[PDB]
Amino acid sequence: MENEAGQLVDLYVPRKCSATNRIIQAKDHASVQINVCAVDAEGRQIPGEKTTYAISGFVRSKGESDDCINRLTTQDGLLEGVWSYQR
Amino acid sequence: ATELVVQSERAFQKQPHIFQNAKKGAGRRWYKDVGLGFKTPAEAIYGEYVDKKCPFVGQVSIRGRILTGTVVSTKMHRTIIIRREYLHFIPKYNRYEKRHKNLAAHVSPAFRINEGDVVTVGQCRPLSKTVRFNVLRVVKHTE
Amino acid sequence: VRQSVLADCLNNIVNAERRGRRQVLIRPSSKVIVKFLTVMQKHGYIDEFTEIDDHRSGKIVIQLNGRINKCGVISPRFNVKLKDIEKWVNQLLPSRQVGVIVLTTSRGIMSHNEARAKDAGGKILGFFY
Amino acid sequence: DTINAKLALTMKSGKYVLGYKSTLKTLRSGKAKLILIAGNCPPLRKSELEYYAMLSKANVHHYAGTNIDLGTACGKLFRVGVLAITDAGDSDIL
Amino acid sequence: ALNKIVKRSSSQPTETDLLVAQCLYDLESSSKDMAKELRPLQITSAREVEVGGGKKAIVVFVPQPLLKAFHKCQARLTRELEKKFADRHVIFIAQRRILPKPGRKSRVTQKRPRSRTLTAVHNAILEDIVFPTEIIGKRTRQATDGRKTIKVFLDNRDANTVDYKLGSFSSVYHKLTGKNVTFEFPVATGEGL
Amino acid sequence: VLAVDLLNPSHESEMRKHKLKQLVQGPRSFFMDVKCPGCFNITTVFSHAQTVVICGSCASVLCQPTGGKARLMEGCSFRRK
Amino acid sequence: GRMHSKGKGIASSALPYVRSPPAWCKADADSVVEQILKFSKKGMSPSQIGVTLRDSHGIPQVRFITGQKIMRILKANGLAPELPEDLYNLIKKAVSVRKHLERNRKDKDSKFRLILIESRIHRLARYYRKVGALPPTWKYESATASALVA
RNA sequence: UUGAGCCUGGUCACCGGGGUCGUUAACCUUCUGGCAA
RNA sequence: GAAUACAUUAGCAUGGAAUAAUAAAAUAGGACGUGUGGUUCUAUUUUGUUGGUUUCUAGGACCGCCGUAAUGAUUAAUAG
RNA sequence: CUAUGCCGACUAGGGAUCGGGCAAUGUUUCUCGACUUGCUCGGCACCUUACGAGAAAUCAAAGUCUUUGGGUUCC
Ligand SMILES: [Zn+2]
């Protein structure tokens, strides 16, 4: 949020989940974020370059973390032939 | 209600200040337009009843409030009971409730009134302890 | 018997949002539902929705993008004047800047802020935030 | 189906007559193809009707049900003792 | 030649109905079932329409009551009309009269029949414009911005000779009504219903 | 799950569903044309016919009304359209 | 939910999205009308005849071809029954139950079923009286229920 | 009776409002003034 | 300077037609109309001021037709 | 008595069970039946879990309620 001066005033801006778009609480210990690096031809992944996904504790407890991660990787192009929108 | 002979009382029923003579065949029939847009019915224009307590061919005048209701009891001579339905607002619950009140009105023979027969009436001075209205328009349920 | 399809539509939407599903199916469909969905979609709470047109009342498939805490109906539809909007906002809305109250005023179905700009009251349909 | 049904089909489009005097007239004329007799009929009348229909080559059916039930199935407020159908019409009673 | 020019229409445009009538008479000159079916034939008016490309379409307003003959006639006459209309698409639409919605000031006791409703005539127009491949599906998508696009799922059978006509169908529909209509055919794999 | 194409369901999924629970409800029956084993005529019969259909030519019972689909007994070939 | 039962059955018929006759079914919209009139001349039920055209004749939903309902077609042609089909069938069932009750005097279950049928027939009669499909004075009679059915 | 294309004078590129043009019929209609096919 | 608002419960009036209610033309017993023929009345008028009939005339109302037109019945609710 | 009003919508995983229907170039039986498997509708229920509720015991309803409003009786 911003005041009249236009400067963002708050303790922090909580990270929104990448699957269901929900706020991750400060004590949401079930929520985790995973990182997958970028690989070129013949392995030898490039250091310093990676894409991260945050999965909320509610999703992980419900058991939808695997499917949500599969969907996110398919959208970002890091995974193929495992997640189908048609179902 | 039912068209009977106009001389059905102990006295002679005649329109006041209406005269018959020889130079002119009998006399004339007097009528007035109650105003406010209501048209005098053709039966009243060419009829035979007297009905001193009638907005047409009579002496009572229509003035005051104009109301509309539904006939609930037409079991009296030249007089019927109508029912007015309205919703009363109770502020505490912010809701409404059904409220009804019965109104007694006088009816001319020019109108045939049964149950239903949404009638529009107008105030025409007290008639007998309850009747301050006269029927001016009829919305028939059959026509 | 179904008394109000708008209540069923909003209850299905809020249930799906709580469950975390990104799509929801509403049956049947009506102009009031379409107008309500348009209002929240214009305000940004609802993604694209498609109306399946069978030879019946119809069906709606709505894409849910989160960012909805609760959407509900206000039954019976109380008549709301201009001065009653503030009371309804205080009673239902979380604050004076967050949330929308939908009123079916004389000029159509729209938000409480837009109706206040129109300077016309009406009947309260529901709320969403 | 049932005789009550078939009687229901024949009453819309068909030629039928009611009572005992009329059914005797139709049998004597010879145009009566079908006769129906109530259960609680006088046995002498039943024998006479059977004899008349045998001579006139008309079909005889003494179906279950009293004259009250027969009349109710016939569509009448009264009691019917014997039916004489001279033309079924569009049904397949015969 | 030998009348049968003005009798086939009501009013007189510059050239459209005149050439339609003369082409009609020339086609009706063939004997047997051709003349038998084309004897009770009437046309009212024709309008030009443009598509995204250089192709031009002509949409003619048939009178409603005699669509029974057209239901079996326009199936075969379409190709002949296409070749004889100087490389222009031909559309058979029915001219229907609508009635205004009764406002509070405007008290009308004549009533609006459901068959003359704008929604009803719009659906009838959509059915009549794509005469073959009867409608099987209809969807109405509304994006976040608020634009409404309607998708019409047609019948898989008789897909030919209409797969290059639905673009003109959409152009005509958007011209006369304004809806963003997109026609689409399904892909029925395997067998079954 | 949590991402389902409700607008375009799977063809197999629609088949393994009730006739009403589909996205668009519709009939599952079909009208077929039957020829008598010893004749040349055609007859249109319903899959879930409730009454016995009688052929106008020399033929036996065309179908037997069961609880669901009508039983076919004689050696006839049917076309579905 | 069921009107007079605890069941929640949903069995019904799903009409097709198409509103047109089949390609081969050249019913010509007038031979079917003649067939309906012939099927009504005998006096069969409008629902029963519609079944016959669906099964034996092979005709689709009659509205898709003729453009009018079975009840509407026969009413236009004049072969209109004095009472509605559902009204007549319920009166028939009520009459049969009362005839069974007057014989079997110890059937309280059948008496309860008769009461349910009497409630159903009265509600249907009230609706038909309001809609105007019947004369306004259509007071159902228990003693003359035999008259009403036939 | 809904969609689209308009302009317009107006304060915060928006908004409120006024309407035909026509698609789709343009203020349904009653009476009047001049115009009268 | 000695303001302004609170007013609407109930009543009068202007504007809007979203929401929710009764009817529109089914035995067409319907907009039908410088309308194919007629009835019946009033004189709002002139025929000499008053009274009376005719009816050109201005008008209310009514009797068999006349096709002006696309003539009229919402889908048929995983309601009944 | 289910110490738990009625109607309507939504809400998770499994396996049994009654009635009906659909399919099986599956087994079996002197034209159909018996067995098995899959799908669906309508019931009686059971096990796990608790997103959710409660004061807790517990509850697929006693959930969708301080984020409080689908309709309606009794108390
Ligand atoms: Zn056979």
Swiss-Prot record, chain A:
GO biological process, one term: endonucleolytic cleavage in ITS1 to separate SSU-rRNA from 5.8S rRNA and LSU-rRNA from tricistronic rRNA transcript (SSU-rRNA, 5.8S rRNA, LSU-rRNA)
Alphabetical keyword list: Acetylation, Cytoplasm, Nucleus, Ribonucleoprotein, Ribosomal protein, rRNA processing
InterPro entries: Ribosomal_eS21, Ribosomal_eS21_CS, Ribosomal_eS21_sf
GO cellular component annotations of the record: cytosol; cytosolic small ribosomal subunit; nucleus
Disruption phenotype: Deficiency of 40S ribosomal subunit formation, this is likely to be caused by insufficient 18S rRNA stability.
Signal peptide: none
Residues the record lists as N-acetylmethionine modifications: 1
Keyword Ribonucleoprotein in annotation: yes
GO molecular function: structural constituent of ribosome
Cellular localisation: Cytoplasm; Nucleus
Similarity comment text for this entry: Belongs to the eukaryotic ribosomal protein eS21 family.
Function: Component of the ribosome, a large ribonucleoprotein complex responsible for the synthesis of proteins in the cell. The small ribosomal subunit (SSU) binds messenger RNAs (mRNAs) and translates the encoded message by selecting cognate aminoacyl-transfer RNA (tRNA) molecules. The large subunit (LSU) contains the ribosomal catalytic site termed the peptidyl transferase center (PTC), which catalyzes the formation of peptide bonds, thereby polymerizing the amino acids delivered by tRNAs into a polypeptide chain.
Annotated protein name in UniProt: Small ribosomal subunit protein eS21
Species in which this protein is naturally found: Schizosaccharomyces pombe (strain 972 / ATCC 24843)
Curated annotation (Swiss-Prot), chain C:
GO terms classed as biological process: cytoplasmic translation
PROSITE patterns assigned to the protein according to its UniProt record, in alphabetical order: RIBOSOMAL_S8 (PS00053)
InterPro entries per UniProt: Ribosomal_uS8 (IPR000630), Ribosomal_uS8_CS (IPR047863), Ribosomal_uS8_sf (IPR035987)
A Pfam family this chain is assigned to: Ribosomal_S8
Other comments on record: There are 2 genes for uS8 in S.pombe.
GO cellular component, one term: cytosolic small ribosomal subunit
Assembly notes: Component of the small ribosomal subunit (SSU). Mature yeast ribosomes consist of a small (40S) and a large (60S) subunit. The 40S small subunit contains 1 molecule of ribosomal RNA (18S rRNA) and at least 33 different proteins. The large 60S subunit contains 3 rRNA molecules (25S, 5.8S and 5S rRNA) and at least 46 different proteins.
The protein, known as: Small ribosomal subunit protein uS8A
GO MF annotation: an example: structural constituent of ribosome
Curated annotation (Swiss-Prot), chain D:
Keywords: Cytoplasm, Ribonucleoprotein, Ribosomal protein
Signal peptide, first to last residue: none
Gene3D superfamilies in the record: 3.30.1330.30
Any one GO molecular function term: pre-mRNA intronic binding
GO CC list: cytosol; cytosolic large ribosomal subunit; preribosome
Reported function: Component of the ribosome, a large ribonucleoprotein complex responsible for the synthesis of proteins in the cell. The small ribosomal subunit (SSU) binds messenger RNAs (mRNAs) and translates the encoded message by selecting cognate aminoacyl-transfer RNA (tRNA) molecules. The large subunit (LSU) contains the ribosomal catalytic site termed the peptidyl transferase center (PTC), which catalyzes the formation of peptide bonds, thereby polymerizing the amino acids delivered by tRNAs into a polypeptide chain.
PANTHER family: RIBOSOMAL PROTEIN L30 (PTHR11449)
Family: Belongs to the eukaryotic ribosomal protein eL30 family.
Miscellaneous comment in the UniProt entry for this protein: There are 2 genes for eL30 in S.pombe.
The protein's name in its UniProt record: Large ribosomal subunit protein eL30A
Gene this protein is translated from: rpl3001
Curated annotation (Swiss-Prot), chain E:
Modified residues (Phosphothreonine): 144, 149
BP GO terms, sorted: cytoplasmic translation; ribosomal small subunit biogenesis; rRNA processing
Organism of this sequence: Schizosaccharomyces pombe (strain 972 / ATCC 24843)
Coiled-coil residue spans: none
Modified residues (Phosphoserine): 170-171
Organism phylogeny: Eukaryota, Fungi, Dikarya, Ascomycota, Taphrinomycotina
Record's keyword terms, sorted: Cytoplasm, Nucleus, Phosphoprotein, Ribonucleoprotein, Ribosomal protein
Ribonucleoprotein found in the keyword field: yes
Family of this protein: Belongs to the eukaryotic ribosomal protein eS7 family.
Record-linked InterPro entries: Ribosomal_eS7 (IPR000554), Ribosomal_eS7_CS (IPR047861)
Stated name of the protein: Small ribosomal subunit protein eS7
GO CC term, one of those recorded: nucleus
Quaternary structure and partners: Component of the small ribosomal subunit (SSU). Mature yeast ribosomes consist of a small (40S) and a large (60S) subunit. The 40S small subunit contains 1 molecule of ribosomal RNA (18S rRNA) and at least 33 different proteins. The large 60S subunit contains 3 rRNA molecules (25S, 5.8S and 5S rRNA) and at least 46 different proteins. Interacts with snoRNA U3. uS11 interacts with MPP10. Component of the ribosomal small subunit (SSU) processome composed of at least 40 protein subunits and snoRNA U3.
Gene Ontology molecular-function annotations: structural constituent of ribosome
Subcellular location(s) of the protein: Cytoplasm; Nucleus; Nucleus, Nucleolus
